[PDB]
Design a protein around this ligand. Sequence first.
Ligand SMILES: Nc1ncnc2c1ncn2[C@@H]1O[C@H](CO)[C@@H](O)[C@H]1O
Ligand SMILES: Nc1ncnc2c1ncn2[C@@H]1O[C@H](CO)[C@@H](O)[C@H]1O
Ligand SMILES: Nc1ncnc2c1ncn2[C@@H]1O[C@H](CO)[C@@H](O)[C@H]1O
Ligand SMILES: Nc1ncnc2c1ncn2[C@@H]1O[C@H](CO)[C@@H](O)[C@H]1O
Ligand SMILES: Nc1ncnc2c1ncn2[C@@H]1O[C@H](CO)[C@@H](O)[C@H]1O
Ligand SMILES: Nc1ncnc2c1ncn2[C@@H]1O[C@H](CO)[C@@H](O)[C@H]1O
Lengths: 237, 237, 237, 237, 237, 237
Amino acid sequence: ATPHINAEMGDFADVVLMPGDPLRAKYIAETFLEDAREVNNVRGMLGFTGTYKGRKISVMGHGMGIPSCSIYTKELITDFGVKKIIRVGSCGAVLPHVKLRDVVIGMGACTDSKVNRIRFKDHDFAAIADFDMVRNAVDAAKALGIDARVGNLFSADLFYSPDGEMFDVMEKYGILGVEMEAAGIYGVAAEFGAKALTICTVSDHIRTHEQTTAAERQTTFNDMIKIALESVLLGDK
Amino acid sequence: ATPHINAEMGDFADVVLMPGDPLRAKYIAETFLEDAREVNNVRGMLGFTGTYKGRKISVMGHGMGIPSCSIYTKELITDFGVKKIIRVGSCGAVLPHVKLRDVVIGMGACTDSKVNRIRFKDHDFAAIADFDMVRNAVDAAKALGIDARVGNLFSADLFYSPDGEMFDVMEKYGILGVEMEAAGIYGVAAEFGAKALTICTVSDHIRTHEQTTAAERQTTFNDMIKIALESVLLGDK
Amino acid sequence: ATPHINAEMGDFADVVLMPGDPLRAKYIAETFLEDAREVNNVRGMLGFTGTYKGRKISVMGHGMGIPSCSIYTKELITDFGVKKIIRVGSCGAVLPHVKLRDVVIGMGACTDSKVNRIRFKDHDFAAIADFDMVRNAVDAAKALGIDARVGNLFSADLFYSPDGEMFDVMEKYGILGVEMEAAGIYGVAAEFGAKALTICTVSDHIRTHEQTTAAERQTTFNDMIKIALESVLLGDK
Amino acid sequence: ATPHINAEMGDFADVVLMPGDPLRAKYIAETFLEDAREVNNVRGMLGFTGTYKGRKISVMGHGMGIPSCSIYTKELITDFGVKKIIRVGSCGAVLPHVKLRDVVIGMGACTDSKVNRIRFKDHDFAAIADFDMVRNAVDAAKALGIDARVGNLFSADLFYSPDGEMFDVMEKYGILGVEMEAAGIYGVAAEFGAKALTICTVSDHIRTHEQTTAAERQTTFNDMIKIALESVLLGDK
Amino acid sequence: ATPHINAEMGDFADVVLMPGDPLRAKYIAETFLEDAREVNNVRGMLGFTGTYKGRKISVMGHGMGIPSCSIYTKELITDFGVKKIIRVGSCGAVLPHVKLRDVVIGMGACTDSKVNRIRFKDHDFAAIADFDMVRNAVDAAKALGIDARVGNLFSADLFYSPDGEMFDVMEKYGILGVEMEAAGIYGVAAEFGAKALTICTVSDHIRTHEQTTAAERQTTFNDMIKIALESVLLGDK
Amino acid sequence: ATPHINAEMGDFADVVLMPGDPLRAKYIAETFLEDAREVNNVRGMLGFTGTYKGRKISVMGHGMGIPSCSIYTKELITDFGVKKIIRVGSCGAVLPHVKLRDVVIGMGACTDSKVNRIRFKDHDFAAIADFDMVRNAVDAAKALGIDARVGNLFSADLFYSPDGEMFDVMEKYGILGVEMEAAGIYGVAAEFGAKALTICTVSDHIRTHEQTTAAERQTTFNDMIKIALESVLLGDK
Ligand SMILES: Nc1ncnc2c1ncn2[C@@H]1O[C@H](CO)[C@@H](O)[C@H]1O
Ligand SMILES: Nc1ncnc2c1ncn2[C@@H]1O[C@H](CO)[C@@H](O)[C@H]1O
Ligand SMILES: Nc1ncnc2c1ncn2[C@@H]1O[C@H](CO)[C@@H](O)[C@H]1O
Ligand SMILES: Nc1ncnc2c1ncn2[C@@H]1O[C@H](CO)[C@@H](O)[C@H]1O
Ligand SMILES: Nc1ncnc2c1ncn2[C@@H]1O[C@H](CO)[C@@H](O)[C@H]1O
Ligand SMILES: Nc1ncnc2c1ncn2[C@@H]1O[C@H](CO)[C@@H](O)[C@H]1O
């Protein structure tokens, strides 16, 4: 077992899908996995294991923020033999040509955190995903008919930022969406030698919030998950 | 109803106790509060409100990490009329003469996070707790005949630090315990004008690696809740 | 005899009061201490030792600035057996509801200096005062029927700041007063294991530019000394 | 005509290859481009424009360092309508498994430079290449049966770094090759909305170097240019 | 008058010599000035005005540290019409080929303070003296027979440094001596448009402290002062 | 033979002039040096060695930017026994009184680069020229009846700075000219114990530029080289 995960070696697949919300991790195991079993529930951070089209897959929440997801991804990679981590979450839009319900894939992730400077002797560590995972994700989305955008994400430490003028900067350097974990997970993946990726759906538009209809918002979230799950099979081949 | 809290103005008391563990909030509600009802469950971040010796009080977890508890403490303060926040969590010991199960009262909190530098034009902001609350707790402890060291805590962004040499520095400066939220909570309290205090139970020792055990886990965590609840009454006097 | 203090082990009491003004130390020795003798005059940094209501106490200025008071507090602590240090100085007000002659008790001290970042591996060190001393003073004040706000001070390196916009930031965060030594003294106290507290008399207002006047200068500065001297006795009880 | 480029709008193609040595721009124009024509000579920075299998292509050296390549790539993007920039050159390996003559593609570029911090409000900007250009280069290499590795690069400001342990860090974080431009080129592209890529060949292994001949070394170089050239065409579809 | 200087326009010469110690400023007025009058004594920081070989000159202490000397030099330049400031003090040796009783002139001054970064938007401001003053000083020392060294000084914030390994760095980059004000005065001079210079005599050798004989040490301090005073006359011509 | 300089020890004189444009190294060798002989061609960085009035002198371009000039000046100092380095070039004025064609001598060089911070433990290193070389250049100019100004220069990493108010700061602190090498050359000299100087001519006034002819512009340039050349001889005594 582990300080934050009460399970044993074998309980998880070598691939773990991670939503920020635990209740959302249960929703995924319910909707897409066959024969899903709960493998952890410490602090209410639900984790499940099952199979998709015959492939052993796991899904577990990682909580909000870099400090939170860092603890979990680290314990999985170094104590449960996990090799891949695909974060499937939500992000806010900054660029105008980016619309609600757009699937974005973070090849890289900018940040206002200090975690990577701490690991990188205070220089700039470019937090990036695994190239193959990005490609698998891009090819799966195409098969499903979705036109995914691949670029930079911004991982913020303050959801309720004091500044706000930093949003002008993000849009200027082409940031595709803002969330809160990418840069942290990538930093962890680099540190312990595993592979990670982050896919997001635009939850709202910083510029002008607002959304469409629940039915459509939920269809796009499912499209994202199918791309995540399908990209894995694709990577097995 | 806020982005992460599904409740209406009135569901929460003007005073909230906050453990990182959602399940611990529930354990507290079931053991110390009377006629307590659940006011939140969004993202499983369970919140409760009942009464303690007549007084109305609430308890809700904040998850792990500064960015996590920042969101929660901020929404309660600006959309639910919360005036006091008392985090009740666990920490790691760095000093030899600091035992497991020990109770520490953070008058201040150091940190390796950037949230505060972003707020204070990159200068050093002394994240300190509210004085009266620090005193109410010190008294509540003396009345309960319980021990409690008052001092500096260290709010870390990385539970699994890549720089262990920083623990000597933490020790050299007498840091009582290592947790992950204090400096963030104290930062937000100041930003939105509120009062906060952090109380912690030494759950483990960083040098000796000794992790909690026996039924001395709960009980010790029962004194921490005792002191917090009682320190509120003194504050009401 | 240290590099900047010409005295021998024993000349100083275990408790020293320290104003920035050397002449003020002398005024204090002549008005509050009994059978006081001069123990230092190197660089004109006058030091005195006498008794107050039976207790042996010393008073010596520290000059202006963190680097200045750092030298002095460090030599007293390591070569004269000093255990407590209580700075008694003046500060500038930033908040509207903070009047001239007001007494502030620095529980913490923010800063734009680098001395602490150099000590804390470039992280945020919460420079806080010793808790019991903060309490002894708050009581000494209540007994004297004197008012005294307890909170954060701001230790500036530049009295004539080139960035006045930082005062809004200081205000926004409720900084009680602007002085130039607190964070340095609290830093040294921690480094060489000692206890310190800073008490200040609002000598001017940064917004209104109102500078002290009338015979209300001295007297107000007489309450500050009163509280300090008395807070020591309480601490002896 | 820009300050450093004496030529008119239309002289350069929408795509430009950039070697370090300006002498290399000539070799490429003569060894690979059809109907070539010099288009710049300022400061000796030789630049040509020709065609590769019907596709108009330009080639021009950029000098050593981020400050240099930054002015060139900027003027081209803002004053000659350049849409894509492919940098070709050499780098030093730090990983044991990365061998001399290995081809490396910088999907991302770390750096010890401050240019991006100055651009991104002193936060962490992830300098990444354009995903499609990356994928094109990989596919094109596969076509030529060459083995290309996709990862992080490190843009050092000092070819002679007074610091040595920094190479240990780079290794620990899987840096593929060390060079001096990628991070600067990526920041500019992001700044003025253009696409860029960096492809390198391991010239030296810093740690342990073998012995490459000028014969082998030109083959690898020509292999890199074919990869860069064929990738454009794929990019074209 | 001024907050720290109780004098009036006209009381000081347009040239001010400033030793760190006030008692030393009186020693200078006594030994080298004709018809010297005390023009300030606030906080015991003695200031004098008189003439040398018919030239009106002033001399006043500036206290220890950048925060201290910054307040005084600023008040003199902007409230008492001072145009030149020559700091005459003591410094510690770092380079072996630098011997006790060597007169060093700081053309520039490195620092561990954060004052200049605050004035210079966080970049590197090279704190330097006025070229003519450096030359006058160099020519005067020659007339007197002294062989002055002209180079860099290091202005420290912590006289009792936590590090100490920074001394290896200073010697490596050729620092001539370490004191505590130069960088601050130069920053002030640049900010308010006046001219400043710093001359120092090696008080000891960090490498191996120790000194010669009082008679010789005091002869060299007087040589320094004569160079300071003589350089002024030289500058008048 | 160094990585960037294909030549042997003895090929370069103890003194080397360095222009930005490598084409300029040729013009100087032919227009001013006797018995000139090319000594390097790598990457097109042309370098020559001849004599000026019996004095052996070398000339070679260094490229644009601190990262570039840093490798060249380093290899020369450590591998060809170069004792002094004089950089000659142009810069942009930011002060109103500094006119086009004005000659400027950088006694110091500010910068927005991180190279010196990386070298000096993240503290402020004052990048200064060698005082005697500075004085020689001034005297030599006077001889040629030219008006030279001695002050601070600013070494910008980005010729196209996204930040604009930074020019206001530079003006406020009396910066004389903006360029891109001085601070890097000075850091290297300090690092390997050598002497260096930078002399510039105002080419543009950034703010308001007039109209200089290629006729006038060459005269100023030749005036600068005579100053640089005559100063060496004075340096020789
Ligand atoms: N504009 C935004 N700023 C910060 N986090 C955001 C934003 N939009 C969506 N998120 C993400 O969604 C959650 C908060 O609602 C977090 O998990 C965070 O990653
Ligand atoms: N040794 C430790 N280091 C850091 N955080 C700790 C430690 N022990 C307990 N914690 C706390 O518990 C959680 C991490 O397990 C966080 O909420 C943090 O406050
Ligand atoms: N407005 C102010 N700003 C900064 N320091 C002040 C101010 N007013 C009083 N002080 C204090 O008095 C001295 C400067 O006059 C320092 O010792 C400092 O603590
Ligand atoms: N080992 C290496 N370290 C740093 N830069 C290198 C190295 N090998 C090749 N280069 C590259 O070649 C040039 C320096 O010779 C620079 O343009 C740089 O990108
Ligand atoms: N080694 C040293 N470190 C710091 N300050 C020094 C040193 N040697 C001499 N000084 C100077 O002398 C005084 C302290 O004795 C201060 O004014 C300071 O400038
Ligand atoms: N206005 C200017 N700004 C920045 N660098 C300049 C300027 N004018 C001339 N230069 C110099 O000339 C080159 C850029 O054209 C660089 O080597 C730089 O030193």
